[model samples]
Target: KETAFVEVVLFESSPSGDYTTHTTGLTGRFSRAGAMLSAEGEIVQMHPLGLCNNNDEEDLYEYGWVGVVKLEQPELDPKPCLTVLGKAKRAVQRGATAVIFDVSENPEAIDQLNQGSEDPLKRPVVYVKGADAIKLMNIVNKQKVARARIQHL
Candidate 1:
């Protein structure tokens, strides 16, 4: 399976008037080339089971986490429908600077998930495992603010 190395720093602001940084390893894919860029933003979970939808909107400033929203079509139709890729595409259109999706049950399929388009994503997409999602969720819930920085090693 393809994987990339990244450094993650979780910041903690104590009630005792102190700040701390917990450095850890982050696993994801960095498909883009050149120097790896770092990003900071709230980790948002797309509603409706994190699948893509047309009506739900968010002022997603930095990152959006979505799921596989595609369904089998009885017959091919011209009307556009929501797919995992579609969700990612829409998130980018809605001003999201980055996108992240959960890894499929089949760990091997994680790297092969569709990113919604062939054209370069205006932002980057990161595929994360369940554990990572839990960690991120905890940070988001506890602090009411979860910031992340992705640095390639």
Candidate 2:
């Protein structure tokens, strides 16, 4: 756990053309006794689900929609939570039960062989040996994302 993480095309949502921001998440890491923090004074815990807004710059209007994807474990980090579990947990806190990944904005995540596209929608992968998945869930579920919806792939 002291070396740099292996780099692969895991994050399928990146290639798409939209800036992502943390809508809702815990401000710090947590422990059985309490919360923790990073040396940089930023929250070192709680993963966040994001939304893809494809509104054109010319149009000041905001059109909100939901995305769907085949939630699966990542290859480099083969964990099912990355696909949808974490996102879904946050969704439940906001009085919702899902967090849409807006794939239309980033169609690349769709695998061509699977859907006649190009490649597999960036392999649905997640880190397997790092933090305890269940504990991470406990932290994220508490942080509520804004109007989240799960994108079923």
Candidate 3:
């Protein structure tokens, strides 16, 4: 078995418009349940946000590689590990699995993404530009990692 990094799209809608976000996920975990389920059968919850713009960033949605990590099983952490990112690139080359990503913020909401990239592993990362990462982290902390699968563009 091998791992791969595949870039897929994640969509978001706000009071203004819809946007896309591009990020990394585990190749195998893409379609599996990330967090341990509760007695009620709810996987988990995450308050996700996205970066949008007037240009409709979804235009960039295409097949690509972001970072896909291989795990023995589904493990939900605040963020992805560097080793995972490295493995993703290798997986993509080795024909494992890659993640799909889409735009999250627009021209106005870029700083958030840049800052999140700085310490992605330290906390849960759901991106929206011009917003505070710490604040956003609060929203997604302890939340269930979203499902990962290749969806239509």
Candidate 4:
């Protein structure tokens, strides 16, 4: 349960592109969700913000991992544990581009596909677990802006 990370496509494609954002449950939460990958990190003025679960400088959607410490289940807040939804709402409100849920911690999260209010998102929301989850954290911890779009494959 310690290992977490996933490899999203690097820089790729002609018709389909190359980047592969490994995730599941796209059909569940989002009424419609991420689907177009294999890009050159290209961006339009519309999707010009960077965020994380991890970056972008200016006019880039460099989303990071859900590296933030948070609780999976609801409980007393005296300890100040941020729930996944709490982080999403706050971060998304503050202008997040994408959020990668560290499902590695909650192994069965995909079964739940949890969502609270303020859940409507323009970008992609991915759930990566175990080894896949760790990979994302490493990338963001290394912290370099990336160019990828949210598209379910």
lDDT score for candidate 1 against the true structure: 0.48
Model 4 lDDT per residue over 39-151, tens place: 12321112111222223343323443222222243233334334444454444455454445655545454544443334444444455555544654555444344333444
* Per-candidate clashes, comma-separated: 0, 25, 28, 27
CA shift at 104, candidate 2, in angstroms? 23
Please give the range of 10 consecutive residues that has the lowest summed lDDT in model 4: 42-51
For each candidate, what TM-score against the reference?
A: 0.56, 0.19, 0.19, 0.42
Off by over 4 Å in 2: 1-51, 55-131, 143-153
Candidate scoring better on TM-score of 1 and 3: 1
Give a tens-digit lDDT track for model 3, residues 1-153.
112222223445577786555443322112121111111111122111111122333222223322221122213323433233232233233332232212122222223223323323311112222223222233334333322333221
- Comparing 1 with 2 on TM-score, the higher-scoring candidate is 1
Model 1: pairs clashing at backbone N, Cα or C within 3 Å: none
Q: Listing every candidate in turn, what is its Cα RMSD in Å to the true structure after a full C-alpha superposition?
A: 6.1, 17.5, 18.1, 9.9
C-alpha positional error of residue 31 in candidate 3 after TM-score superposition, expressed in Å: 13
TM-score of 4: 0.42
Question: Against the true structure, candidate 3 has what lDDT?
Answer: 0.26
Report lDDT per candidate.
0.48, 0.25, 0.26, 0.37
Off by over 4 Å in 3: 1-11, 27-147, 150-153
Query: Taking the tens digit of each residue's C-alpha lDDT, what string does model 1 give over 86-116?
Result: 5555766765555555443334434345323
